[model samples]
Target: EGREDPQLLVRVRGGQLRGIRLKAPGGPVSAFLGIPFAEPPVGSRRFMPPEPKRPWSGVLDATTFQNVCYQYVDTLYPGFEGTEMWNPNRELSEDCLYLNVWTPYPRPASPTPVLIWIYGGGFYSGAASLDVYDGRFLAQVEGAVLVSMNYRVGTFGFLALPGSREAPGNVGLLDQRLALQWVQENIAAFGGDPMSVTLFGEAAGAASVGMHILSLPSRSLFHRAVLQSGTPNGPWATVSAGEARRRATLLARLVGCPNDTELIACLRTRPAQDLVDHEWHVLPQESIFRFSFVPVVDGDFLSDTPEALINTGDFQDLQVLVGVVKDEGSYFLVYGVPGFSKDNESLISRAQFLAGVRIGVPQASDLAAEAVVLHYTDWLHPEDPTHLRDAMSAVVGDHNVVCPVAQLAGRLAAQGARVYAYIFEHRASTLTWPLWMGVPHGYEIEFIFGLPLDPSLNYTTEERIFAQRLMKYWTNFARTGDPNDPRDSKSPQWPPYTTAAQQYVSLNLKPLEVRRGLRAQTCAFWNRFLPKLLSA
Candidate 1:
């Protein structure tokens, strides 16, 4: 017979559950994978707000990852191996509302801080079980209870339509709310301090967290938030309700569904994967970084546009950590335009640059777009196509992520929230991106998740050291409001970000040093110049 540890068995509100024992070089962890937080959204539950899972009779097995939410192998971004690497090797299904947990074994002396990660895949894709997101190392090394949850994606998650009340929209956001409520109630049972829970996400996931911050219902669930690379500002993140209804109509049409009162009812009859396959066509036109199915400003769930809510909502008590990568747009640029990375000297023409401005800022008027073209024009190398490409990438970064994020950080700081801002400039050596693309999006995941510590990954010596440094900062922030570890006085001091100083830490190998003016010039073009020109 094998020995057993009581820590591997846990009891939640629903039932008793058993987890698998896990170990890292430093310590031990008890990981419970695929524990259902809500009833599977199958049959009548499809396209509906999630229902809390009912109590079970026996000990539930929480040892293996369950089926991931139904989603197709999206080719929205072409020739990009980065996204391909995340394709689920596990089974996919509509009946997936599971969550996973990794807790420090033997339990912390007192309750420890909890970190909940919501994933990113443009809101239509991504899973909680992606290998890069493994929370074992963070739990084992930093001694925090980490959690990841699976929510529905694609049309399956964000379906909204006209002529039908069956799906009023933002159920995907509702799914997240239910999951957070479950954690707030049940995490203490796993030795996590409910009051110290920190909600963190990357890309679309970060935007999801951004949405939760503004939604009145979700504000009290977590004490702090960390948004990386994305937020719910531009059209890409949240479209008008009418636009969402139009997208649903297009997708429903693709699958031969009726547009009457039974729209969602008809959609329910189609195979989940059949509907997903047709999701790509929902985009109104060919464009860059725009998704067809995403959050809509539902009267209740979203209340108002994200920017309006930030100005109207009282977020002074919230502790925020927001950031973006240096080349937030290269991944989108390289993959957004097929044959872009081909043998064209890695440069875009003046015409091509103008077209890019329109493609990225789909809402900009003709004159507004031209103004952007002028502001972003690279006179530094007038005839250099490669430099044009560089300038184009900057435009992509500013419009899509960088400037929008800066707006969120500055507004929140101005409104009296405690903010810590950062820009990650480190690149993982293993990525196969073009030499011109400096640290494309999502490369920071490796460091935050501590992939460098794994000898098998062969993370560079400095990367390994940096990974350790990042984990400490992330965990330290969750424990206290500040990223600097109060215990480790030697840890680098990451100063508080504010509107007055516009200070933020630049995260890279050289050092975690404070710097002022993170892309201030370009951000001004986005936040000030373009808006003024558009109104004029």
Candidate 2:
């Protein structure tokens, strides 16, 4: 063991740990990677809640990253070159229940705020081990403790049965719950303030935070939450208990267990590779809006529907900072909608545009669907196809991510919880996306992770600054629940969200602009008017 600094050696609940030191902009930083937080969910433990990791005597090596949860990369956008970078390149396994920690070197005198990240992969695939999610910069730049964990993604995590028997639903969320519990019980050893923990995630990760918010058992685990480009309020966030049962059984039969007798037990005996290969393909009606194996409404884990709990003001205590990008639908325009035009080099026909909108609105009633078509129509030249592709992208974007986030923020703000909102508008020059695509989903990730600021990447000066400010804003929010606290005098103050004005910060290098009503009309149609029309 090549070790020297006494500071690098710290004791957590599991035992003493020996971590490696890494270089950062602000000199060196400490990283304790691949620390086990739970016993492996393998063999009999499959499809079960996480068990606390037993203690170890000697210092356990925590320098190397561990196995990521199992996932098949070939199936996910195998045709798209832009998505190739996100493919999983690490070893995958059933015994994957690990977390990584990063902190500023030269140990601070007082405990620092903790920012825990959860990655999104539409509830099926993602890895905390991915190099892009590396949290060293967030720790070095913001002087906060940063953490990310790997959780079960698809079948292994979210296979729900008829009753909440041994195979209880939401075991993946339980993986998260167990991780939060670990932080509270042991993060102090790493100089992190467990009380000030701010839970944040992108897409499915963001929606997972929403589940914790709605969960009475777990809501107190984190004091604040930051949901980026995703919300539990979306129709796709959760399925009914009955829906979960049917899907679970349907999957069991697909994998060769036809009878319901000991259904989950049969699944437990199946090969992990066999399970990973089978994905939940939605019917034509679901469009690209649904996931096959996802969180379900088990009375214990999720007491009720997300919207019901949110609307009742039950989830009003925690501070929430939620927002979405300008063109959330653009990425899906190509990914989900089969024939929609990506770039406007050539225009789409009126029929193509209407059908695109129709696919996105299957969750809506026919009247509501008709209303959405009319709402997105550019009456100036309704038949003209100049920006019809863009409009179709907007239709799916709002329905999928943008509007749900806006709706959830307003619900929090209206319920008296302190809320902060923003619409990230900056488009990275290095992104291969066409200019018309606007800022696609997850574009803001690297900026917040401080990837652009890396001198080796040779990112533009503006991009470096953009990444820096984003890091500051996100860290400040984690520290004080206000993005402007311990304020950066140069950047414009980020506005606090309110029910009336519906304000948000427009993020770009030009200048951080605090703007009002992020797509008010579009959001209103989705959140208020459409739902009412559907009920009628």
Candidate 3:
């Protein structure tokens, strides 16, 4: 078995006790697709932790992808057509917890580092089996084994309640932990070095990676992490159990499933397609409040805020790479298809800020709104309703994800861990202002893997260069915890993340240099205001 050859090979995976052949575009490489790491959480198993899969007799077909986890067709983002975000396929069911793998030249003597990716969509969407997320490209380019997983989502993964200690609040986090544990115990069969694993994610997925770093169960499961577009901040990340339950109760009622027992059972027994039909709209509108089901500070997995835990040396030794987009909220504008309304506009008034005193984010009503005005006024053509919508997107970006991310970086860097930050400036071909807004969130995914944007997209040559540099930097960091390696085949003289000058590189447009600091005093403002709002 030569690593240089491009072919797909079949091999027996550990957990399944079945042989699988992977289609290796580069050459013959042992691989497996759609292997179950956990029992199909169907029927009676729904709303509970994932159970182990039943052993199969002999080899199962590992070539075809498994039916994707229950998600609305539209929720797959641009990947699937003619479906909303929550509607699983008409035939979808709960037997969806599965994983996919791509290994190149698996040899007992040449164990490769295992890399697991957790896709991002505010924890309510995304699948582990998308072709774009295929691990073969990574295996071909980096010679590392790759694993992408699918976990429960929405009410299935993050439902919380009072008087129900039996209900696991962070079921999504638990699902992820179980999957990682499977990898630790079984990756050797895929020619992966189980001892050396990195958990990486973006958006809610990134937040999950952060939560795992601070959790007791996942402490030693992975040695490295990459957090993109999200972070763990005490004030803005999540609310206390009481607050979460309050909202959950309301949301459950909103969907006509109020009883915890009944609601939980309904979710478990209901047809997957019906569930999607009911919740598909929430898929794209999640930026508004989709991240509500977050990793709670329960004594079991996460005992404290990730920032507090990291600052107190809870995750001091973990190798980390955390970053956020210059405008992480831009995608909301495009996806939400925001339209103007003086009604919603009134929500930004000073009176509204005063009324929100219970939440402490007076600025989310005032200064944050004003910041939005400034950022989008000219770019979006102020006189239009679309401009207001774009402004709202920027406001959400700052309030929800970006500012918190930078502050998280500061917290990690203060803990004496090597921390680096970056701002992706490359605007993809699909970018549409007043519609698409600033560097739409997750636009960097294609570039991160060196895949071309959709044919309809018009990614410029400069964006391609930016993507190449990013791939090198990311791969280098995965190989060795440090991101500053001069041996990269692409760019030169990458630097370690430090606070001396608070410098970071811009990925696209002219002057690809490290800027001195963040824009608009954004991170500082967030750190100052978020706590006041959360506890208000």
Candidate 4:
């Protein structure tokens, strides 16, 4: 069985990892598509912290994907084709604690930096094994070891039941922690520098990285972090694990699972479709069930809140790059909102209601509308045709996305952590047809994956160049820790975080721009009530 490059087999003795390197479909590389990093979370161990993968005597295939943790297909975001219910890389299964690694130069001496990705779908409903998450581009193009992993999601991942403190909740966090530890031990064999690892993810994945930065167990695991389209402590970014568990319990009872262990076993046995079918029970009627499993601030795994952690000096000293799209909330605006509305009153009512806000309508209206205009300015971007949609999406983005990103960045900057921020404004033509969702939440995913959107939008050559430049900047960040100080292969010097200047990069169409006033005003609006909002 000789291919351009024969599959190279290696074992991680006394460690929860192993891999096979060979020429993949696109290029010469090594791929360990689905290597189990943690023991199956089933039976008695259902709600416990992840356990190390049991070592086996013989070499496992390491080529095929593992079963994904159970997922509700109805709510899972579909890929372009819309046929598959769950992420395709791995099928949903309780036996899931798997991780995949791609190394272009799979030689011991290569010692390339490792880029580990945590997939985003809230805290539930995503698999690193998704086809869109192929890390071959990062490994082959950037010559770095690219590792993407899977953690428990939904109820399986974030269950914090009554008297569940002994387990300390946040199984998803525990799963990620164990995977990083496995990488540190095993990445060397796959030609990755075990020490210089960057932890990155988008949306919930990004939020997870934020929590990991603050987690005591994860302090030394990663040297750098990249958070895209997500931040901790905003309306949607961060919340208590206890709250998430209560919600999980409600979801479980809705599905007929009585308590913790029974819920795990019942969920394992129940058809994945049931999860999706019952999504309406959990999500607002309008939402596409965007994500059901919210990250929990379990006391042990996530301490001192991400805001407090970064504001104080709770996290490790690490170089950081974090940003959200100019219209990060477009996905919610277009898809989460059943029938879009342009009137400020309706928008304000909906926003305040969903946010559980108590402010009077007049103040809330002004605050909400101002927040929308400040974060998203379709009025200014006359070039974009869907200005109205962009404006609406901006409101969602600021309330759910932007302001929180700024809040976290400001807190980190105030505490003296080197933080760089950006707003990716590159709108997608493919998404243009959806009427809204301009520069939608997942719009930058192609750039991150180093691919153009499918059904190729009539993107001008400049847009393509922008994608490449943005990709280079992101890949550079993945290699090192700082996105601002990109490499020679990357674009020009992107600056670091500064409060006085408040400089930030904008990855919109046609030559990039360095803009100031990234998140000054909106943060004030959200933080005005602080501890009151914290309890809310």
Candidate 5:
């Protein structure tokens, strides 16, 4: 492979790898795709933490992306034409432990800062090869090395059975840790600074980034973290080990494996699709924010809950940037299943809306449920309850995403960690379905990656300028801990967050500036009132 394109061949810890060159706005960037960071987690290795990739002899071709981890087909959403709202069109496989890298200048005077992306699909569905995540634009425009790694999802990734090494949980997170380790050891070959690595992700990926910050094994793997619309302390972000094992048992029984040992063995031998096919029924039912599998407190990587760790000041003291979209819950509410909005006549009436918020806590009292409904009643629409479903989405968003993030930011800031926060409000006209939704989830991705939007949307000139500014702020933060580079006058001066001030940068079409107390009353209700209900 090196014989044909010697420039793309780079020798690393294992062996020489030949990557492909792709055109970029700023010339060309070398893409090292499908490079194995760990051995295939198949056969006896199923449900186990990733081991190092076995060394390869001759120059390995790293052009095409590998098969994505096994997952069910994603549900199609409206206004998602010509978009990768789901995984890439690749076959499923358990042998999916690959990472990709994009480096514009492979050899520079100073090694460039590395930004490692972790995709979020509720810990169930996602692939590094998704079109939205193409690293060329970011790599070329931002002038930093960009990398994305694939970890297992669903039952294949998070199942915790009844044994020590037989079925350990959090193998997906372990896969991420191993990939970070691989980066630390090998990224320098492609002009990436091992020490200046920043971990960033959206939704579940953002939560995973926060988990890595709290985790002992992966905390030091990154120097900074950028969490977009997710925090590990969110109710649905984690499950207890017992709950994990119970789900595992349910899955085993569904596949007709009764005994623990026999069940685990049988599961390993079964086809990957068999497990994927049975996830819907095996997973417990919930009204909102339901995920069949998620990371659990394994007592090793994650010692206690994220809240527990953060409260005890056990998390790494790295520079943190955490925030959410203006209407993060809009996506879930707008596209939610029909049953979630149904109101039972006698036993329940619009209680399904409350049921969505009471995800981790099932036995919440009627008064507790009513309190939440009352708290968010102001957001309700007057005419159509279906359109008013967006209010319920706000409630779930605060409970699941917003409140947790606010509390996390407050706690981290109070502990004197340099934290920056933002609310992404630059509405994308291309997202017509969610236009009324107000900066819905995953909208910032296009702007963040500097990818073009659908021409039909006709983004305003100011919106285009805002996108450039947003990109500058992100890349600046990755380069230095601060988003503002005094060298460039166009760069906005974003202040560090504090509990007393509650300052956050507001990203909109207008000139960017620090805004105080975003969603102040709603966040206060969660941080002040909800805890009392929980304790009572």
Candidate 6:
């Protein structure tokens, strides 16, 4: 052989595994992909909490990504480029409890910090191997270990019906817990510091990070957390156990399985696509976010609602970085309603808000609903549909994402936890969205991962600098509690958020500056009206 093959080997708890060596611009890196953290959740193990993987006798190949969890393409948000966006040429399977690791230093003088990424697709869809989520750049540039894991999703993962021990809800979260435990035991072999792990994610993934902070089993696993664009306390994040059971029955009947004692066994044998295809019909008729198959309040995994638990100081003590974007609802508005456009000249009436409130709060009297409509529609706008669309988007954004996040940040800060709050306002030039839309949901991902926007985009030169600035802040936080890098003179000082001042940093190209009153009026309105609406 003229040169040595780029094959690497490492011994973990389950067995000796083989991986591949890749060249980073900085240096050589080791990539161990598709190593199972738990036994395949098939046959008898369906819907059961994850069990340890069976140990192997010889070197098992871990060079390539394994099959992703089974999920259909995103018909709902085709603006996301459908299945090609998240799954992107990946195969599907039920046996997808694998994890991947990227490490720059196979053998280190000292252990390096580790960042475990969890992908978000509204709980029902998402894969660890999505191209945008590749961890090589982060690991190579920041000199840290990056880990990503796959868990069960949709009915296979969150189904909760009356059954034997196997049908308990939150099995998907349990899968994540088992994976973190595996990392605790084995990641050191790959030069990752077990004690210095930071759990970070966006949307549903960020909500999972919040759930782990409340769950006892996952409390001690990570030292820090980053919640981006989502939280466990969001209206759609958790459903009641009663609702979960009803949905389970509906799903069983839809797929021609008995909704009885043998439901788990019967549904397990059905074709995966049959279950995925009919998932949408099982959703509850009344929901603000139109989400289905979310986590339920299982006694074991989630002791109570996230808000109730947080009120009683029931979460783990850890540093937290939480944030939301400027126009989160623009994405939902554009994608949720088919054929929606900003061209119509018709004015948005008060009746639309009243009708929407009625759907979400059936028990509310006309007077109460009218008050809400008045508060949200107080702003002046053009008679044209474009401004009307912007108005509706603002109301929805505050109600759905921004307000809940602000309340959570205040609660955490009130509890004396070290919390840093941020609002992402930079709208990349690559996005073709209308000017009225501002920055839509999940727009921060490209900049955070240092991925290039579309080549056709005519962005400012400062956008690249801002991306680098964010990467430094994020990686520095993973290494230490604070995002500030004292060694670098250019690094900005991000202040800790507190309830009294309610200050937060705006992440943009201008500078990392602290500002008070992030959408104060809207948040106050939401904080006052949400309880009454939910009660109704």
lDDT of 4 by residue, 307-351 (tens): 667677733376788898765764554334533432222232334
Model 5 CA deviation exceeding 4 Å by range: 1-3, 76-84, 105-107, 314-316, 334-363, 379-387, 453-461, 489-492
- Error (Å) of candidate 5 at residue 443 is 1.3
C-alpha lDDT score of every prediction, in listed order: 0.83, 0.81, 0.62, 0.65, 0.78, 0.77
Models sorted by TM-score, best on top: 1, 2, 5, 6, 4, 3
Candidate 4 Cα outliers beyond 4 Å, as residue runs? 1-7, 14-27, 74-89, 106-108, 165-167, 257-292, 314-316, 341-391, 429-435, 453-464, 484-492, 529-536
Residue pairs of candidate 2 with colliding backbone atoms: none
Give me the runs in candidate 1 sitting further than 4 Å from their true place: 1-4, 75-81, 162-164, 342-345, 490-492
Error of 6 at 275 (Å): 0.9
Query: Which 10 consecutive residues of model 2 have the lowest summed lDDT?
Result: 337-346
Residue 498, candidate 1: Cα error in Å is 1.2
**What is residue 202's positional error in candidate 6, in angstroms?**
0.5
Winner on lDDT (1 vs 6): 1
lDDT of 3 at 16: 32
- Name the candidate that leads on lDDT: 1
- Model 4 C-alpha RMSD vs. true structure (Å) is 5.4
Task: Please list the Cα RMSD from the true structure of every candidate, rounded to 1 decimal place.
Answer: 2.1, 2.2, 5.7, 5.4, 3.6, 3.2
Candidate 6 least-lDDT 10 residues: 337-346
Lowest lDDT 10-mer window, candidate 1? 336-345
Compute the lDDT of residue 53 as modeled in candidate 1. 97
Model 5 lDDT per residue over 48-150, tens place: 8889998999888899888899887654542355234665556788989999999884444578899999998889888999877888877776777999999
**Model 2, 193-243: lDDT tens per residue?**
988999999999999998888888787789999999998888777888888
- Itemize residue pairs with steric clashes in candidate 1: none
The 10-residue segment of model 3 with minimum total lDDT is 353-362
Could you arrange the candidates by lDDT from highest to lowest?
A: 1, 2, 5, 6, 4, 3
Whose TM-score is greatest here? 1
